[PDB]
């Protein structure tokens, strides 16, 4: 498993404008167009983004650039920013899979954010991870998803995706 493979399980496959659990317009394996409410906006965003005029829609490789665009730009955000980059250091190859994860779906500066859960990866304490993890709007509003990460930095296997 990786975490294409992972993200893929998470997030779906879409080839043309949908909301996603919040509403907010997305296409792809995930890719948040906009936060706004217009659907032109959206469709705006989309062509500005592929290069061309798509009008709501987008072919299986277009939906995979993307994703590749993606899952780089929050690798590099994790490698830049000061509050993750050590934790990220300091884990092995599937729970890094896990923190990648969390700022595809919520960015840097959410997952920054989880102070204390941090603190517990770092030291090691996993079973305190996955109890401060829980206790978040994130757990709350998706479950499921929540609960496959979290398990993941749990046991620091793929039980849960497999
Ligand atoms: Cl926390
Ligand atoms: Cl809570
Ligand atoms: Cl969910």
């Given at each position: 498993?990786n975490?294409?493979?992972?993200?893929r399980?998470?997030?779906?496959?879409?080839?043309?404008?949908?909301?996603?659990?919040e509403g907010?317009?997305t296409?792809?394996?995930g890719?948040?167009?906009?936060?706004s409410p217009?659907?032109?906006?959206?469709?705006?965003?989309?062509?500005?983004?592929?290069?061309?005029?798509?009008?709501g829609?987008?072919?299986?490789?277009?939906?995979?650039?993307?994703?590749?665009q993606?899952?780089?730009?929050?690798?590099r955000?994790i490698?830049?920013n000061?509050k993750?980059k050590?934790?990220?250091?300091?884990?092995?190859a599937?729970?890094?899979?896990?923190?990648?994860?969390?700022?595809?779906?919520?960015?840097?500066?959410?997952?920054?954010?989880?102070?204390?859960?941090?603190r517990m990866?770092?030291?090691?304490r996993?079973?305190?991870?996955a109890?401060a993890?829980?206790?978040?709007?994130?757990?709350?509003?998706?479950?499921?998803?929540?609960?496959?990460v979290?398990?993941?930095?749990?046991?620091?296997?793929?039980?849960?995706?497999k």
């Amino acid at each position: 498993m990786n975490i294409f493979e992972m993200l893929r399980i998470d997030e779906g496959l879409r080839l043309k404008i949908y909301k996603d659990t919040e509403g907010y317009y997305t296409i792809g394996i995930g890719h948040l167009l906009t936060k706004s409410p217009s659907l032109n906006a959206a469709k705006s965003e989309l062509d500005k983004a592929i290069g061309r005029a798509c009008a709501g829609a987008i072919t299986k490789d277009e939906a995979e650039k993307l994703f590749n665009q993606d899952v780089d730009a929050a690798v590099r955000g994790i490698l830049r920013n000061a509050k993750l980059k050590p934790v990220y250091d300091s884990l092995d190859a599937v729970r890094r899979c896990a923190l990648i994860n969390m700022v595809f779906q919520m960015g840097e500066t959410g997952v920054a954010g989880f102070t204390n859960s941090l603190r517990m990866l770092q030291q090691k304490r996993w079973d305190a991870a996955a109890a401060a993890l829980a206790k978040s709007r994130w757990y709350n509003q998706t479950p499921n998803r929540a609960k496959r990460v979290i398990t993941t930095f749990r046991t620091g296997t793929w039980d849960a995706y497999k």
